[PDB]
Symmetry: D2
Subunit: 319 residues, 4 copies
């Protein structure tokens, strides 16, 4: 292989630039040309595609977002859109693709592999919800964004002796909520993977202000519901000054943590390695602190777990 | 004067600990005892009041919030509550008070001055809306909190070529919005002090994506209305992927900037100075980069201004 | 067991407070009293020891440093000092210790175990150089402190087209330098575990400014030598504007990352678990993303490794 | 005037990009072309000069450093180099310059003004040492960088009960040291503008550990001397665990504070205003919180002051 393409799709995550940078530098190390495909899969159709040179990735490792941009491409799922896509690839003689992003995106990449264009998938999402990896690029950075906000809310909650409900992103996964709750010492944490009881939660909360906890923080993964809901249902059964904050899209942006930069660098180079190796339809990741890769289809079946032993601990440390 | 009290009321702001620390150290420098009154004016009634020693303020300069806590005291406005308050003061022989916080709080302090208890007011609020000062303690820190969030939203807005409406606090004042908009290069800024036109705003926004601005940031002071409102009214007349984020209470918390620490230190010591000087019913502040103090009643009349020359500039730099 | 003690010794690391908080809450969860021993082992001698209550650990999870303090105790290594230590323990009926900190500290804890006081060791150091764990509490936070400083130096190095040598801590281990070099995209990285050639480094550096790299960052673990030394030996063979910066003790302080909070919470609670279990002379940690514990003596022999596959990568991505 | 040029020289400072962005947008607002001159004055000689478009300044307001780069140009001081400079300007028909940076740089701009090329100077330096302005672009951001490092050192100094000497930049001015010392609650502050006594400093320091201050922070402007020097002379007369840290070039880099963005935006636009007005040989700034401009030569004579009333305060709050 002498020429490959690279793109980012799904929700952007911090560390995507560091991955792109890694795919480019690693390929050029091996005398392979790399083409930046812009706007996710929507670039395979518009043909917005450009050679990426060394100087192209020379000031991005520390930058949030993706310099290739990202976009939803239903067009590409159609046989028509798909072949417009393939035709643009052949046209530039691109032989393989590294796809960086969500689990929506791993489908486009197995499709292309079956049509002669080997693709390797790279997990980019703050949600930490891609199978085949303990960790996705942007998770760690998200966590730091969250705890930073929580730390600031604790200052005001404490000064005013108020209780706060904080909604975190995560889509359908409780990892952000679970790790950020733990890390911020939240009185309770609500996540899709583990049962909660709202009465047990009020209870823990009255028996905190009894003993003189004046303030509390409750963490709610957006995958369980709305913080503005939980906050009111709480104000009712305690008649107690409650505030809600919905952190929102800040969780997505920002210069990536050291953890995410290293992860993106390691996985991006890894991906190129397998492409240049005759492997296609694989995704890479980190499992048990070891770099692994997997047949994509084998593991799109497998369902996501948080570590329950970590949820228990959050209960034991909140009392 | 040999014994004074100090308290924080209204919304807490970062830098309040640094002010308290300054009031305590400055008084003790002058052989004056200081008493920490907890829970704002609500402590003058409960009598939750404690001598503050040097070691009391020895690890707070960098801490957000107020270690004296703060609370609303309608009780204290009543003649009854007020005299319970006065009685607790006499009881401990506290002769004067430094009051740190909002403009609600400057009233309690003029009241006490007329009843023989000289009080000096110190501007603590992130809103920057206290007359007698160009700047209030916590403003600068708020600004940094805001631009930090904006910087993170710009990463995702840019990657996805989306337009964002960001709601900032400020109560009734546009200073947060105005300074943060400018500082983040917002396409437009909505503030109570200056007229905006929503059509002029859509216009500036179509004539941006014409020339190929894929993304925009619009800043809305909460004193003009709801970002979830503006965001939808925008989605309608552009049919264009709009997102809203309501920053919320993070703007209130967090370790204070260097600017706020210095300001709080300078004003807190200044306040003690005037108390120990036979001045009462005064507030202090910084005007034209000079430390000043003012008869409170003379200037509770005066109405708040942003700098309009700074609003113009924001228009000229957004086009 | 109904009563245990906890202390921090060695160099302090961010996340030590979160570990202490976890040891306290986890033990109180199980109806076990906990005593805070201050000033490391020097507290077992002075008897500066205090019961720790729930409210004791109620505002520290996000705090850098150790609220129990830490100090070197040669005294304690002596039979005399040691038995003054033991006598204070019996005096308060403390039956076991959780020891949080460096590998110096694991010796004190095996000593106590042989003298009827079961001790469990917990890895607290930014150096990431404790055997039995892939990661030590404070490493991740150190990394972020480093990359943050690097990011700032890159700004000025880039603007002025200068080359910079940056010395990072790590004692005898290259993990900080290795991970932070990778994460910051350093042109080269000098670490004790892997050979470097200074001429190969000048070479990579001339062949960078040939192709128009105006600026470079070189990372030096303090365990290989002095940056002020490498910088000059570089200025000589290139006659090229070189700057050195020695990051220093900032790498030790600061509010811990989400990663370090979680790690410290998990390992702290884990430690209590084994103490309360009849296990002594063990240290815990995380290996292959799994919580593990080890006979201390078995593994004080084992020698530290960085991941060499990660050093290669840094070479491949710098060219 | 229809065509101007803009460049940055001297030490780079955070907020220089925001100033450049402001000069460009403000001129284009008025139908005036702007040319980016690269590498400071060294670009007037090499002719490395490029038209700057709107999209040129579209993603820099939040960026540290200068995208125009900066360099020392002794060549330009020579009549020869100077006229190669002028010839490149005429060649592109550039009629005026906005010069952003140090006080070295204000000389180049008065020179050009006398040779028919009106120039306006804009204060860009972290040192806050440019006459005609209370504040220079990058100062505020420097302060925050410093206090952030101090806050981290306090964590470890406190945990270990050590005393620390911290050297800060500032060249010949004590403003960084003075403001950051105040803001960090330093035990003492050494600055060129105010006398210190080393024995008075040891004294304050023994009478601190008498009363049980276990740790202290001393701040030294690099313009008074070396921290590694003060630290040793302190270790001698106290025999007390002393540590030195030289913050270094981190103080120069990093995304600018909200304060610096606003200042740079305001002064940048202001500069263009005067150029387009027939004013030349002027520099702008902020004095008594008011935007002002000054004949350059009139005020290169005037000598720099810190506010002494602010140094006193630091003495009074440290005791």
């Amino acid at each position: 292989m002498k020429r490959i393409g690279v793109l980012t799709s799904g929700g952007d995550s911090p560390g995507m630039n560091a991955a792109v940078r890694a795919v480019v530098r690693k390929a050029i190390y091996h005398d392979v040309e790399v083409y930046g495909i812009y706007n996710g899969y929507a670039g395979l159709i518009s043909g917005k595609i450009e050679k990426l040179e060394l100087g192209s990735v020379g000031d991005i490792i520390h930058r949030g977002g993706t310099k290739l941009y990202t976009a939803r491409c239903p067009e590409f799922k159609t046989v028509e859109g798909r072949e417009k896509g393939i035709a643009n690839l052949k046209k530039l003689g691109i032989e393989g693709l590294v796809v960086i992003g969500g689990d929506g995106s791993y489908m486009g990449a197995k499709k292309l592999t079956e049509h002669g264009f080997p693709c390797v998938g790279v997990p980019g999402t703050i949600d930490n919800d891609i199978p085949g990896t303990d960790f996705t690029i942007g998770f760690d950075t998200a966590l730091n964004t969250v705890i930073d906000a929580i730390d600031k809310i604790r200052d005001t909650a404490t000064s005013h002796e108020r209780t706060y409900v904080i909604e975190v992103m995560g889509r359908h996964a409780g990892d952000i909520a679970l790790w950020a709750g733990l890390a911020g010492g939240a009185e309770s944490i609500l996540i899709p993977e583990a049962d909660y009881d709202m009465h047990e939660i009020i209870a823990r909360l009255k028996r905190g202000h009894e003993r003189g906890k004046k303030h509390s923080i409750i963490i709610v993964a957006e995958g369980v519901g709305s913080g503005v809901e939980f906050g009111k249902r709480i104000e009712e059964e305690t008649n107690l000054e409650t505030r809600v904050s919905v952190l929102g899209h800040i969780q997505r942006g920002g210069s990536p943590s050291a953890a995410d930069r290293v992860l993106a660098s390691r996985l991006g180079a890894y991906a190129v390695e397998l492409l240049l190796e005759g492997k296609g339809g694989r995704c890479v990741g980190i499992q048990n602190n070891k770099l692994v890769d997997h047949d994509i289809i084998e593991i799109l079946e497998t369902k996501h777990t948080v570590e329950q032993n970590m949820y228990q601990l959050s209960k034991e440390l909140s009392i």
